[PDB]
């Protein structure tokens, strides 16, 4: 808790759905948004901060609260848009040999600024005396270890808590999340949403030789004609859907009522029957 990591993760597709099956977590409270909607929001960089506290201290990790750890080791303002993911770790972080490894900085002068790490080891000076380094009656060790033992009960066990702070500064967002991708229907007028490029057409197989860097493709006069599949390399062709004008040939309402219907721009296979120019 006095020296916690600040891993700045960016430039990845953060699949938060996988985090629900990595480890048997015991706390997945996200204050900012819903986990379902989190996979559709881009972010610049996520700050992962991990630490170890007791079971009775997990309640102290909140966006604004006091406590022996909430205002002495790690404080969260009232803007935390991440999660408070935490889980018990009383399987490998507790042996009967003396757990004089951790500490929680029992002594302090005042409340620290939220989102700040204080890596200090100086002797706590309780005023009215210059302590150049001494331990008696005026100045003591401001650090104290825990008493984690395997033969104990829940509430005072090693609980690993990791928060994922989110931020959006004046910088382009790198991490966005998963992106669903369906199959591709060939030789059928359907809709497409290829990398923001939205429209409708008949995705057919083309023989165009695109450059290794080109993705989209236009025509002589401002119209998309062929694009590159974001999946395995395949050159497709986007031709607009089947449309035409309907004309009615009628001999007049004086001898009969039989009429003929002419669909323009069709091959009699996309609407006796005759096919003319």
């Amino acid at each position, epitope marked *: 808790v006095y020296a916690w990591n600040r891993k700045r993760i960016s430039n990845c597709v953060a699949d938060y759905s996988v985090l629900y099956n990595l480890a048997p977590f015991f706390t997945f409270k996200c204050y900012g948004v819903s986990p379902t909607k989190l996979n559709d929001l881009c972010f610049t960089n996520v700050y992962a901060d991990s630490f170890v506290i007791r079971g009775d201290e997990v309640r102290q990790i909140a966006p604004g609260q*006091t*406590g*022996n750890i909430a205002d002495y080791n790690y404080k969260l303002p009232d803007d935390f848009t991440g999660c408070v993911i935490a889980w018990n770790s009383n399987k490998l972080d507790s042996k009967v040999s003396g757990n004089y490894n951790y500490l929680y900085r029992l002594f302090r002068k005042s409340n620290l600024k939220p989102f700040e790490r204080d890596i200090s080891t100086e002797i706590y000076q*309780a005023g009215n005396k210059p302590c150049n380094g001494v331990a008696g009656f005026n100045c003591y060790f401001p650090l104290r270890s825990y008493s984690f033992r395997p033969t104990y009960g829940v509430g005072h066990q090693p609980y690993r808590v990791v928060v994922l702070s989110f931020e959006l500064l004046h910088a382009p967002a790198t991490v966005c999340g998963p992106k669903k991708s369906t199959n591709l229907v060939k030789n059928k007028c359907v809709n497409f949403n290829f990398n923001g490029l939205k429209g409708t057409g008949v995705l057919t197989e083309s023989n165009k030789k695109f450059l290794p860097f080109q993705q989209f493709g236009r025509d002589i006069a401002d119209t998309t004609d062929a694009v590159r599949d974001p999946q395995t390399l395949e050159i497709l062709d986007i031709t607009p859907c089947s449309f035409g004008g309907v004309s009615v040939i009628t001999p007049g309402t004086n001898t009969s009522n039989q009429v003929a219907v002419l669909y323009q721009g069709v091959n009699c296979t996309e609407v006796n029957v005759f096919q003319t120019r």
Partner: single-chain antibody
Amino acid sequence: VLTQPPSASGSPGQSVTISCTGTSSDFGGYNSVSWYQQHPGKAPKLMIYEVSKRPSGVPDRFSGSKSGNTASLTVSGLQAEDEADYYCSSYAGSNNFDVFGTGTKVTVLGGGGGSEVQLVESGGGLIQPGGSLRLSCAASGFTVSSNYMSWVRQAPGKGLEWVSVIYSGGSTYYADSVKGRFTISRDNSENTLYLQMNSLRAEDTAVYYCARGEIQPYYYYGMDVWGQGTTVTVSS
């Protein structure tokens, strides 16, 4: 709520070995059970804080091992003339008051801190019911603004209980007895630190004690020094 023996007078100094049962656990986290010797008149004095390593004092009372689910303070062979009350502290859960015990009469016979830092109070003689009275414990020694102090009240017959806990400079926690009607306000950072009554509800008749150190999360602090209390004497 803890379990303590009402009295203990048989077999003086041979098989007394008083303790405090009613835990049914492993003392929560930090296994630090303190023992306070409340004496009529002057303020109580600490006897031992851990299971071993007794502080500077009487050397005939040690070996407070945690047997079963209770700390058995070995007091046999101490003396044969004492009139005080032994209280133990446990239940170190997060924000859980009432860590003291009930009145245990450990009189083996029955019939037969002053200049350390400071000891001052307000002297609330004939307190009017209500209003706002301030009680201070100005200490010319240890800093009254950096250490972790507390306020504990006790009434005739009833035992002690945690009434006010305050951290270094960023906590103003109150006990469950007041539930909000008590507002702690720190005085000047270099003069003293006082309290506030804030319209008592006729239950504040008990005498107060401003301790320079915490009770349940007690630290060595060099030495444990207490101060005499004052009688509120409400007239509700």
